[PDB]
Amino acid sequence: QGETLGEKWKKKLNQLSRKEFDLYKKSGITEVDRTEAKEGLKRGETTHHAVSRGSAKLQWFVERNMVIPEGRVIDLGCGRGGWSYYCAGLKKVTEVRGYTKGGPGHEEPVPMSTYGWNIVKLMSGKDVFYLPPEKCDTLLCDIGESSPSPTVEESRTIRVLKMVEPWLKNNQFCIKVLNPYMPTVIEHLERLQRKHGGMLVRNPLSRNSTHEMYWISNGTGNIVSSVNMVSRLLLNRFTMTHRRPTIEKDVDLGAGTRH
Amino acid sequence: GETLGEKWKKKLNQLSRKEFDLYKKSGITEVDRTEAKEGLKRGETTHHAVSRGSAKLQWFVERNMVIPEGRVIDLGCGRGGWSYYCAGLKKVTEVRGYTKGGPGHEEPVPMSTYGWNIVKLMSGKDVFYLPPEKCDTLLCDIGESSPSPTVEESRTIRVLKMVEPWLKNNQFCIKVLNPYMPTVIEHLERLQRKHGGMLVRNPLSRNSTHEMYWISNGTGNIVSSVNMVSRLLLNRFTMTHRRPTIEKDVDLGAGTRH
RNA sequence: GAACCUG
Ligand SMILES: Nc1ncnc2c1ncn2[C@@H]1O[C@H](CSCC[C@H](N)C(=O)O)[C@@H](O)[C@H]1O
Ligand SMILES: Nc1ncnc2c1ncn2[C@@H]1O[C@H](CSCC[C@H](N)C(=O)O)[C@@H](O)[C@H]1O
């Protein structure tokens, strides 16, 4: 008994057909236009274009002062490099180290020459769960793989919260919490908020198919209710007549080097 | 963190032969074979089901979970249990069975039960290399157990990958050997999204297998239905031993068809 | 689950 609203959403999500699923996952969200950037990357251009939808996702938090990237940025699970290359352009940032898993069927870092590329080092073939924590001014983390099983998701997100903990001391952070509605995840987030502060936030660019929320450093409030609000919002988008995504323009990351 | 099915496997593996022999049949339903086994040794080719498989398929058919029609293709047919059962069904027009064969592997058995003349079983056929054809119903019972769940996992995924291109607008009943492992759950989800259907537990399955069948005529959350089986099998560890419920075997009759 | 041991 005692089934949470996120769990109720997950069951309805899974029991969706493929036509239904592709309608739902984008219904009423905001989305960045990528057609311009996608064609530039195939052409082989290394300037102006964001590497992925990730840049625009991070920017949303940064525009709202929820994260304030400074000095030494460490980016756990950097993938292609969207978050890293974004941070490189910001005035307060001095260096960026990105780490990613890589390997077959997983995303590999892309060499770029967008504004601030020369303070960026992305290394692949690194399992972040075995990377000794280092002193850094801002910690970014986007790790956490979806499962149709919320209890599988639960233990994956707890594992992230366990490895992410010893990286946080006196720093700005933005950490993906894959599944925040499961009871045991809520207990750890509570204990974590008590010790390092911050808030959980929904990103509008996140699809309806994920219950993704981000643990942000600059903010405060009730994580339990903010989680429940996401649940109701997503549940309501099942019955709500399909809406087209709100299309915004992509990030322009410019060109050139930095000091 | 570990899944409920994974917990079940670790317990299963840590049992004495005496416990394992008690557990594997505790509280299951079972078909009586003494009648049929003797007739087959005697050399009879009518009435008798070739294996316990005929009664296993019937359980789904009785419940409208699979509805075998027209051209039935049966991957990993073995002795012929599923093929010969279907042959006697009203809507079926032709049956094609394919199996591995060779030493130590089950060879097809020639029978003259009702509808035998619309059945063709070919042995010496590795199904992973059989080009997919158009058919009205697809049956698949391939999948070998292993004490290692990660080994079962990859075996189960390889089956799911080969079976997929056979599915279009047809009835199906596919054995899913290990449905509790995380990456199998991801695949089954993507498949149900495409081809619909649901995962079901057959009561004639032993407690030593987490076996489930992906069937065409159904719907539901596979995560919760897999988990119910895990709790069911976990409960049967502590429950006091129960005798198997014995049922009568299938009578498959005799004669030919149009 | 066996180069090999126990289960
Ligand atoms: N244990 C681990 N260690 C390092 N990387 C991991 C990991 N587990 C998953 N990952 C990687 O985490 C990456 C997170 S997705 C990356 C997005 C990215 N923020 C962007 O803008 O483009 C995935 O590509 C996955 O490859
Ligand atoms: N890759 C493969 N290709 C073809 N047959 C295979 C196979 N792997 C296993 N088999 C055969 O698949 C069969 C599955 S058990 C067969 C039971 C059958 N449904 C019955 O009612 O009697 C086994 O005979 C195995 O020999």
Numbering used by the authors:
A (entry chain D): 5 to 263
B (entry chain B): 6 to 263
Q: What did the article's authors report about this structure?
A:
The NS5 protein is a 103 kDa protein consisting of an N-terminal S-adenosyl-L-methionine (SAM)-dependent methyltransferase (MTase) and a C-terminal RNA-dependent RNA polymerase (RdRp). (3) The NS5 MTase transfers a methyl group to the N7 position of the guanine moiety forming a cap 0 structure (7meGpppA-RNA). (4) The NS5 MTase catalyzes methylation at the ribose 2′-O position of adenosine resulting in formation of the cap 1 structure (7meGpppA2′-O-me-RNA). After each methylation event, SAM is converted to the by-product S-adenosyl-L-homocysteine (SAH).
To start addressing the molecular basis for the interactions between the flavivirus MTase and longer capped RNA substrates, we solved the X-ray crystal structure of DENV-3 MTase in complex with a 5′-capped octameric RNA at 2.9 Å resolution. Four MTase monomers assemble into a ring structure that encircles the two RNA octamers around a 2-fold non-crystallographic symmetry (ncs) axis, whilst the other two monomers make no contact with RNA, but participate in protein-protein interactions. The cap moiety occupies the GTP binding pocket while the remaining of the RNA chain makes minimal interactions with the protein and appears stabilized by intra-molecular interactions as described in the next section. Base G0 is sandwiched between Phe25 of the MTase GTP binding site and base A1. In addition, residues Lys14, Leu17, Leu20 and Asn18 together with several water molecules make interactions with the G0pppA1 moiety. Interestingly, our structure shows that despite adopting a similar conformation, the path of the RNA chain at the 3′-OH of A1 is not affected by Pro152. The RNA octamers contain no complementary sequences and stabilizing interactions between RNA molecules I and II arise through the formation of intra and intermolecular base stackings and non-canonical base-pairs, resulting in the formation of ‘kissing’ loops. The atomic distance between the methyl donor in the SAM binding pocket and the N7 acceptor of G0 is about 16 Å in our structure. Our structure does not represent a catalytically-competent complex for either the N7 or 2′-O methylation. One possibility is that this crystal structure mimics the initial docking of the 5′-capped viral genomic RNA to the MTase at the GTP binding site prior to the N7 and 2′-O methylation events.
